Design a protein around this ligand. Structure first.
Ligand code: NAG
Ligand code: NAG
Ligand code: NAG
Lengths: 317, 97, 97, 53, 53, 53
């Protein structure tokens, strides 16, 4: 019952797309890739979209110690605890499932998601994105108060439930592979394993697109062959980094988890200001701990509003 | 907020143009020729300088449009509630007018 | 205007005729790999939220605290109210007391 | 050596006056000069949205 | 960019000895636009760098 | 005699109390709780009192 709704994840084998900065390198093709980012929660939450789904054991399941990244035209294996996301400060994960990630995360000028692969590599890549949260209330802080007041904010609660909006599924395109062009005696041979590789050549007759056959074109050269492999087995997410064939696209639906809900939200209470009133004039000593907001207005017909953030000791009149 | 819905780009390896325009908002019917894309398998297809790139995009509402939206309103004549407490000799009662 | 406020000026949540003037513009992809380049100004809703500031609650010309459920404003003094009351003869004693 | 490319500034021309709206994603630079004999140069870094006339 | 430089490694047994140095590393960006990540889609302006063999 | 003064640590069983942010949760019970911080030296010295000695 709990694991019955993971059947939608029969769709496996996500893409290995193009991402800008390889970290160490300049450009690389990486199993992990940063996509659109959602940021509408009012308590500094984030929503990161990653091609490599998590919590997969070649079938529907939920766990905390298994990740299967994909490099090439086959599946692979790694460990979830090694997955790390960190901006300028440490970007801590509250709990994730599927293709999407959420995290408490300090402000910074860039984003990075990294995870250890099966052996001796820390392949990953960064992304440019700004994160400048607007804390609720008139006090700016980074840690929950020991004493404070309740003012609600919106956040993504942790559950696995169906939703309204959707992402797009479609048949994968035909990726190419040049390693299937092993020439041994001046003869062009097609190997096995990958199977049903599409074929097309100007080399001569015999351009049919052999399907799961060890067909061999004779007296030919590698430079005239441009074979590409296709499977038509499992459908895949539609990104802006892979091609697509013209068709209705057969939009498949996998519900986006972690919807947006109201919640109670604690906020600190500043120290009582020091007051020493005189004659028709009022004087206040302030002891701010962090940049806060102070404002006042006249109850008479002329408001004359004043607002000015305070972050240091200062006399005010 | 607005979501920029952009489908996967269309590569067609024949060189013949293909233009269309439906009625959903702000299509930008742009077609490009002579593109030679690359891919992790080195490359795909054979013909160079004769390829068609069809890339389209549009905008739509967001998923949190139900919650994070903002509203606009117009002012008009306004009616005022008044909660009054009345008391006299051995009588003390509130009301609403 | 594309970005000031209400770049989307869609009507009620029924989601019909989602007008938008966010000024899309595509570009020719480079020869390196596959690209979907476009130019898109950031949403004006986010900018308006970021700037916000000095809400009308701190701008009432008579210190009139404002609520939001029936968009109401409470506890402010202006002018004066008249009253006309009718009192029955049985609510008080005669002069003999 | 790759380098970013900022969005096209929003131009709304008046009469004998040019008004432009700038939507920067990072601190960039905007400069202008006049083809007349007196150039009257100008340079000023930009980090947030701003209007310039 | 940072205001100090430190490098370290773990030696043959349970030690990560190291030492720092004062160094105000403030790389001036190449081009009119500041950034920290190479464009998704961009334009080339020639500059110089070290070579990797 | 080198380790004799540790005898005063026969007092044992450090407590487990409430702390502000546990990382994974808003409220959380941890064996490490930050007591009031000592800071009176002149070389950036910080002293932290934690329940678990
Ligand atoms: C590749 O296939 C297309 C479509 O079937 C065909 O027009 C073209 O001639 C083929 N390429 C070669 C080199 O024959
Ligand atoms: C959050 O609260 C608002 C106002 O009470 C309400 O309109 C909205 O439906 C609530 N959303 C959720 C997810 O509870
Ligand atoms: C009327 O009754 C209320 C009941 O709470 C009481 O508080 C109030 O003082 C009464 N009015 C007078 C004039 O005593």
């Amino acid at each position: 019952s709990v694991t019955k709704h993971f059947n939608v994840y029969k769709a496996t084998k996500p893409y290995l797309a193009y991402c800008a900065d390889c970290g160490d390198g300049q450009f690389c093709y990486s199993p992990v890739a940063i996509e659109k980012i959602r940021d509408e929660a009012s308590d500094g939450m984030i929503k990161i979209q990653v091609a490599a789904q998590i919590g997969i054991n070649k079938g529907g399941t939920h766990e905390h110690n298994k990740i299967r990244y994909i490099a090439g035209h086959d599946m692979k294996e790694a460990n979830r605890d090694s997955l790390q996301v960190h901006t300028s400060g440490v970007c801590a994960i509250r709990g994730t499932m599927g293709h999407f990630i959420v995290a408490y995360c300090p402000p910074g000028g860039e984003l990075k998601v990294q995870f250890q692969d099966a052996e001796s590599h820390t392949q990953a890549c960064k992304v440019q994105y700004k994160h400048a949260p607007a804390p609720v209330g008139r006090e700016k802080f980074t840690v929950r108060p020991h004493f404070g007041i309740e003012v609600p904010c919106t956040t993504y609660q942790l559950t696995t439930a169906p939703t309204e909006e959707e992402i797009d599924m479609h048949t994968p395109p035909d990726i190419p592979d040049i390693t299937l062009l092993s020439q041994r005696s001046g003869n062009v041979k097609i190997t096995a394993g990958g199977k049903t590789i599409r074929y097309n050549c100007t080399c001569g007759s015999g351009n049919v697109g052999t399907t799961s056959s060890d067909k061999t074109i004779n007296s030919c050269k590698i430079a005239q062959c441009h074979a590409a492999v296709t499977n038509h087995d499992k459908w895949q997410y539609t990104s802006s980094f892979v091609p697509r064939a013209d068709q209705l696209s057969r939009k498949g639906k996998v519900h986006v988890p972690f919807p947006l809900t109201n919640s109670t939200c604690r906020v600190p209470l500043a120290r009582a200001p020091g007051v020493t009133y005189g004659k028709r004039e009022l004087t206040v000593k302030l002891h701010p701990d962090h940049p806060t907001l102070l404002t006042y207005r006249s109850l008479g017909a002329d408001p004359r509003p004043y607002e000015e953030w305070i972050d240091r000791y200062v006399e005010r009149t | 907020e607005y979501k920029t819905v952009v489908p996967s780009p269309y590569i067609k390896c024949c060189g013949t143009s293909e233009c269309r325009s439906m009625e959903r908002p702000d299509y930008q019917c742009q077609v490009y020729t002579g593109v030679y894309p690359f891919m992790w398998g080195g490359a795909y297809c054979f013909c160079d300088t004769e390829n068609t790139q069809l890339s389209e995009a549009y905008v739509d509402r967001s998923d949190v449009c139900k919650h994070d939206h903002a509203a606009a309103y117009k002012a008009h004549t306004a009616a005022m509630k008044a909660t009054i407490r009345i008391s006299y000799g051995n009588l003390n009662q509130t009301t609403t007018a | 205007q594309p970005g000031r406020f209400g770049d989307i000026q869609s009507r009620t949540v029924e989601s019909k005729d989602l007008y938008a003037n966010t000024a899309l513009k595509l570009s020719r992809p480079s020869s390196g790999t596959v690209h979907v380049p476009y130019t898109q100004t950031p949403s004006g809703f986010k900018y308006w939220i970021k700037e916000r500031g000095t809400s009308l609650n701190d701008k009432a010309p008579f210190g009139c605290v404002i609520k939001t459920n029936p968009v109401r404003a409470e506890n402010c003094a202006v002018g004066n109210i008249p009253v006309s009351m009718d009192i029955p003869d049985s609510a008080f004693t005669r002069v003999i007391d």
